[PDB]
UniProtKB/TrEMBL annotation, chain A:
Pfam families: TetR_C_1, TetR_N
GO molecular function: DNA-binding transcription factor activity; transcription cis-regulatory region binding
Gene3D superfamilies: Homeodomain-like (1.10.10.60), Tetracycline Repressor, domain 2 (1.10.357.10)
Alphabetized UniProt keyword annotations: DNA-binding, Transcription, Transcription regulation
InterPro entries named among the record's database cross-references: Homeodomain-like_sf, HTH-type_TetR-like_transc_reg, HTH_TetR, Repressor_TetR_C, Tet_transcr_reg_TetR-rel_C_sf
DNA-binding region: 24-43
Any one GO biological process: regulation of DNA-templated transcription
Listed PANTHER family: HTH-TYPE TRANSCRIPTIONAL REGULATOR RUTR, TRANSCRIPTIONAL REGULATORY PROTEIN
Domain HTH tetR-type: 2-61
Source organism of this protein record: Streptomyces coelicolor (strain ATCC BAA-471 / A3(2) / M145)
Identification of the protein by name: Transcriptional regulator
TrEMBL record, chain B:
Annotated protein name in UniProt: Transcriptional regulator
Keyword vocabulary terms for this entry: DNA-binding, Transcription, Transcription regulation
SUPFAM superfamilies: Homeodomain-like (SSF46689), Tetracyclin repressor-like, C-terminal domain (SSF48498)
Native organism taxonomy: Bacteria, Bacillati, Actinomycetota, Actinomycetes, Kitasatosporales
DNA-binding region per Swiss-Prot/TrEMBL record: 24-43
GO MF, one example: transcription cis-regulatory region binding
HTH tetR-type domain location: 1-61
Gene Ontology biological-process entries: negative regulation of DNA-templated transcription; regulation of DNA-templated transcription
Organism: Streptomyces coelicolor (strain ATCC BAA-471 / A3(2) / M145)
InterPro entries for this protein: Homeodomain-like_sf, HTH-type_TetR-like_transc_reg, HTH_TetR, Repressor_TetR_C, Tet_transcr_reg_TetR-rel_C_sf
Keyword Hydrolase: no
Length: 198, 197
C-alpha cells in the first residue's frame, strides 16, 4: 500500500491546477492518505518535488505528439504544446523556467527538439548551443506570461518625446496579446535558425 | 509625510547596489518608520507603488544614454542597460514585464526604442506591434534570468537516440544566461532587418 513517485507527482499536478495559490506538502500528503515525512522519501526537498512535478507537465505536453511536417513546423508544434500545457500551471512554469527538469518529460521534449534541429541540417557540433538558446527563449516567454494602470505617455511632453506621443495610442500593453507575441517571436527565432542552416 | 519623491528616492537607495537585497515594500516601510499599507494608500494601490519603483530602475538604466551606431546597435545598447539595471531585481523585472512602469524611465526607454524602430525603415503602421514584441522579448528574458553540469544524466539510446548522443553537452536551462540574452536578441533584430524594406 504505497504510491509510486509517478503517482505522487500526478496527484500534485492536479492539486496545483485548482489553487490558489494553497499548495503544500502537507496537503499533498493528506490527499494521498500518507504523511509529509513519508513523501520526503521520494524527493530530496520541496524544490526537487516541484521540479519533478514540472517534469510531469512536459510529459503531458508531449502526450500524443507525432513529429509531422518540416523541422520548423515540429519545433513550433512542441513550443505551442509546452505553452498550452503550462497555461494553467503558472507556479510550475516558473520552476521549470528556472531549473528545467531531468526526467522522462524533459527527455521526450528534448529528443524531439534535437531531432528537429538535426533535420534542419544545422551542424551537430552547433546543436547543443542552438538547443540551449531555443529552450531559453521558449521557457522565458512561458514563465513571463504566467507570473488598467497608468500608461507612460499620459502627461509626456510631446516635444521631449515625439515618437512616444506619435505612437503611444496605438501601443498595446505589455501584458496584452501574449499568444500572438509568443508565436511571432518564436517564428522570428526559427527564421534565424533557417538562415544559419545550409 | 513622507512625500512621494522621498519614498521613491528611499526605494532607489534600497535598489542601489551591493548589497542591494531583493527589494521589498515591507523593508522600505520599516526603514521609513511607516507601514506597507500606508505606502500603498499613498500610491493608490500596491501595484502602482511597485511600478513606480520599477520606473526608477528604468530611469537608472537610461541615465547618461547617448545614441550611437545604427538602429540595431541602439536597440542592443538599450537592452543591455535594462538587463544590467534589473540584474538583482527579479520581482521588479516581472512587474515591469507584466504592467510596464508608467513613468519618466519608461518614457525615456520607449522614446529611444521607437526612434530606433523608425530608423530601421519598418512601416510606421507596424512599429507599435514591433515594439510590443521586442519589449516582450527583452523583458521576458530578463525576468526569467534574474533568480560539468547537465540538463539530463544521459538518456536511454533506444528511446532517445539523439539526446543520448548530445546529453553530456547540454547545459542546465539556467546556465550561460547573459550570452543567451545577447544571441537571442541579435536573432530577433536580424529578423527585423530582414523584414524591413
Amino acid at each position: 500500500r504505497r504510491w509510486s513517485t509517478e503517482q505522487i507527482l500526478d496527484a500534485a499536478a492536479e492539486l496545483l491546477l485548482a489553487g490558489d495559490a494553497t499548495f503544500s506538502v502537507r496537503k499533498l500528503a493528506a490527499s494521498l492518505g500518507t504523511d509529509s515525512s513519508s513523501l520526503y522519501r521520494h524527493f530530496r526537498n520541496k524544490t526537487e518535488l516541484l521540479r519533478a512535478v514540472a517534469d510531469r507537465i512536459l510529459l503531458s505536453a508531449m502526450d500524443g505528439y507525432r513529429p509531422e511536417g518540416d523541422w520548423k513546423q515540429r519545433l513550433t508544434a512542441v513550443a505551442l504544446r509546452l505553452r498550452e500545457s503550462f497555461g494553467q500551471q503558472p507556479q510550475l512554469a516558473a520552476v521549470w523556467g528556472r531549473h528545467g527538469s531531468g526526467g522522462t518529460g524533459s527527455r521526450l521534449m528534448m529528443e524531439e527538439v534535437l531531432q528537429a534541429l538535426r533535420a534542419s541540417g544545422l551542424p551537430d557540433d552547433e546543436i547543443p548551443a542552438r538547443y540551449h538558446r531555443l529552450v531559453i527563449l521558449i521557457s522565458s516567454l512561458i514563465t513571463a506570461e504566467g507570473g488598467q494602470f497608468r500608461v507612460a505617455v499620459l502627461g509626456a511632453d510631446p516635444e521631449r518625446f515625439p515618437a512616444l506621443s506619435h505612437f503611444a495610442r496605438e501601443i498595446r500593453p505589455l501584458g496584452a496579446d501574449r499568444g500572438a507575441a509568443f508565436e511571432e517571436i518564436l517564428a522570428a527565432h526559427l527564421a534565424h535558425l533557417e538562415a544559419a542552416a545550409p
